């Protein structure tokens, strides 16, 4: 329960950073490698951006603790505050031996965002982002949450981009065991 919310919150935070990096929402100069993970990770060093992402997700954490969260969407906007890109994380077993659970979610997402880096055109300059939280059917000081408008939700003709990983193309891997 608690542990799942914690794993997901950590993952989601790093994920926000890697989206901002790969998509150049902010200048590459604010990003640095984190050797705290045994998977490659770029994260912002910009203290106020980091505080912002952290506050956001630590508001989301209590809802994850009780499975009230249907999805978390990281939305990339031009500064017309139109959604131009939507990273949807739907919220719906393995050993720690090579990768921690957090690192496994990171590896999977890194495989996806790397394809992303190749299929998607560059975004216009001056893009920003926000996070949308999608609760299921049925905190912090001066960090309130409002109801989203339907301007930063819907798109003129959204295109689902299947981010099919490298391996998926190259290799299919199957395990057969005895009796």
């Amino acid at each position: 329960g608690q542990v799942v919310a914690d794993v997901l919150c950590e993952f989601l935070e790093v994920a926000v950073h890697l989206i901002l990096y790969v998509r150049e929402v902010y200048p590459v100069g604010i990003f640095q490698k984190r050797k705290k993970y045994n998977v490659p990770v770029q994260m912002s060093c910009h203290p106020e951006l980091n505080q912002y992402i952290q506050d956001t997700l630590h508001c989301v954490k209590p809802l994850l603790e009780k499975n009230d969260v249907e999805k978390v969407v990281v939305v990339i906007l031009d500064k017309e505050h139109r959604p131009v890109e939507k990273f949807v994380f739907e919220i719906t077993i393995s050993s720690d031996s090579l990768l921690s659970h957090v690192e496994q979610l990171l590896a999977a997402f890194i495989l996806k965002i790397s394809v992303c880096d190749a299929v998607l055109d560059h975004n216009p300059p001056g893009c920003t982002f926000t996070v949308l939280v999608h609760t299921r059917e049925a905190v912090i000081k001066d960090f309130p949450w409002i109801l989203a408008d339907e301007q930063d939700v819907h798109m003129h003709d959204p295109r689902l981009i299947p981010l099919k990983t490298m391996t998926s193309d190259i290799l299919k891997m199957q395990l057969y065991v005895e009796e």
Partner: peptide
């Protein structure tokens, strides 16, 4: 169900 977002926008840089 919302959706909900932070009132305060992401910082600038």
């Amino acid at each position: 169900s919302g959706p909900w977002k932070p009132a305060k926008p992401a910082p600038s840089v």
